[PDB]
Amino acid sequence: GGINQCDIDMRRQNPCSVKKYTEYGDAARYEGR
């Protein structure tokens, strides 16, 4: 789980997935979200 960025970003497109308050890279995203 969560070892391939190219897979994480693909799984992020699912609309029926529960939102998480924080994700791994949140601390370094300049744009946020």
Binding site: K20, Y21, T22, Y24, D26, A27, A28, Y30
Partner: protein, 434 residues
């Protein structure tokens, strides 16, 4: 070896390359990436508070123009001081706003303010004013954003800065303009080696912040994903089939409802089937809460606290967490000043020197004046000193006649309680004295 000769022989030795300073080796802290990295660091409460306290201290002070030393009572110098004082309040924007914009160099390490002049013809011009004497004054001192400054120009062999270029392609859409060095002031937080961009104070706290935010994120994710104690249901495989009999489907639906809606309540309870296989001696059904064996190997709270304290130590701003102790003072005229105030004094002196050397001198030239001296701008104290100590000291040293009392001494002593220098015509009278 060559013989001694007057005039320069070497160079600063700066690492400028194609107009961009390359002093900092880390790519994350050079020009293009530093606009974003510094904004990322300001999001941390510790760094933000440390920067904001310093910014607040500087903005607390008042400014004034005074005659140069040695000619304090000369009427000509008094008139010059009055003219320069009136210049401060005649700008398109308040002086306090100008000082506020200057403090942006507490983050990027430098600031650039362009100089704009006007004629004091009252209102018959592009820029208006309250005076009609026709002299030359200041119209405004706008700031030029640090994120737009792109290239620095130097002389033939990199001895001084001759100009700068501002790129305006991404700022809401000529797109590029060039400013000579004589057309603007340059403030620097720290100017060792003569680097035009100075040195931001955030560089000292780069590593502690990088560790702290990362560890905080790890702790938050761990708290989110801690799953000890959640219910678990185990059923024979044939209950989960799609063609199963209606009874099994109803059983599975009820199990789903239970999983979704079970909460701690005064009616909490379970009635569950129980059958132990004769040949395996293990229940085929089960209801239990998932368990965990080990414990986290590291205490994140202590690490985060340590890194926060390390960040606070970089700016010498521990007062934020330890409160205002009685052994430290914010007054520069009191013999208990803290390091924060001592450093704010350095910043204030830097601003004063830059203003005096860059703005007043050019204003004298434009007006075609030669007075052998220039009026100097000076600032005041951040906070008044302690009164008990000063009072006791004055009393002790004046009771024995070892200190000469002077009108200037009275004026200074009145300043500590916010009173004007003196009034020599309105004395407290006998009729109101018991």
């Amino acid at each position: 070896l060559p013989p001694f000769r007057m005039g320069e022989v070497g160079s600063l030795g700066l690492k400028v390359k194609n107009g961009r300073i390359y002093e900092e080796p880390r790519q994350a802290l050079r020009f293009p990436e530093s606009i974003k990295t510094f904004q990322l660091m300001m999001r941390d409460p510790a760094v933000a508070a440390s920067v904001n306290i310093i910014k607040m201290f500087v903005r607390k002070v008042n400014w004034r123009f005074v005659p140069p030393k040695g000619k304090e009572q000369d009427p000509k110098m008094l008139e010059r001081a009055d003219f320069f004082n009136s210049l401060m309040d005649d700008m398109e924007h308040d002086w306090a706003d100008f000082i506020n914009s200057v403090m942006s160099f507490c983050t990027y390490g430098f600031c650039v303010n362009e100089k704009v002049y006007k004629k004091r013809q009252g209102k018959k011009g592009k820029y208006q004013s309250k005076f009609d004497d026709g002299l030359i004054g200041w119209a405004k001192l706008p700031i030029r954003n640090q994120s737009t400054l792109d290239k620095w120009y130097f002389d033939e062999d990199f001895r001084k800065v001759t100009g700068v270029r501002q790129n305006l392609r991404n700022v809401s859409h000529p797109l590029t303009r060039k400013l000579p060095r004589a057309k603007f002031m340059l403030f620097k937080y720290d100017d060792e080696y003569g680097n035009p961009e100075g040195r931001s104070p955030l560089l000292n706290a780069y590593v502690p912040w990088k560790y702290k935010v990362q560890i905080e994120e790890y702790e938050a994710v761990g708290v989110s994903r801690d799953l000890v104690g959640m219910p678990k249901i185990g059923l024979p495989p044939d209950y989960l089939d799609e063609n199963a009999e209606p009874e099994k489907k109803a059983f599975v639906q009820y199990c789903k409802t239970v999983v979704n809606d079970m909460i701690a309540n005064d009616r909490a309870g379970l009635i569950w089937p129980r059958y132990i296989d004769p040949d395996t001696k293990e229940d085929i059904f089960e209801f239990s809460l998932v368990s965990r064996q080990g414990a986290k190997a590291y205490d994140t709270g202590s690490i985060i606290d340590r890194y926060s304290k390390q960040i606070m130590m970089a700016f010498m701003s521990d007062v934020l967490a330890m409160g205002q102790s009685k052994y430290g003072s914010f007054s520069l005229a009191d013999s208990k000043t803290s390091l924060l105030a001592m450093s704010v004094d350095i910043l204030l002196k830097q601003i004063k020197n830059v203003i005096n050397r860059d703005l007043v001198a050019q204003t004298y030239a434009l007006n075609m004046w030669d007075d052998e001296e220039h009026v100097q701008i000076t600032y005041d104290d951040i906070e008044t000193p302690d009164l008990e100590a000063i009072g006791s000291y004055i009393q002790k040293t004046v009771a024995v006649g070892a200190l000469e009392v002077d009108k200037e001494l009275s004026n200074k002593l009145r300043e500590h309680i916010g009173l004007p220098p003196a009034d020599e015509s309105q004395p407290v009278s006998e009729k109101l004295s018991p």
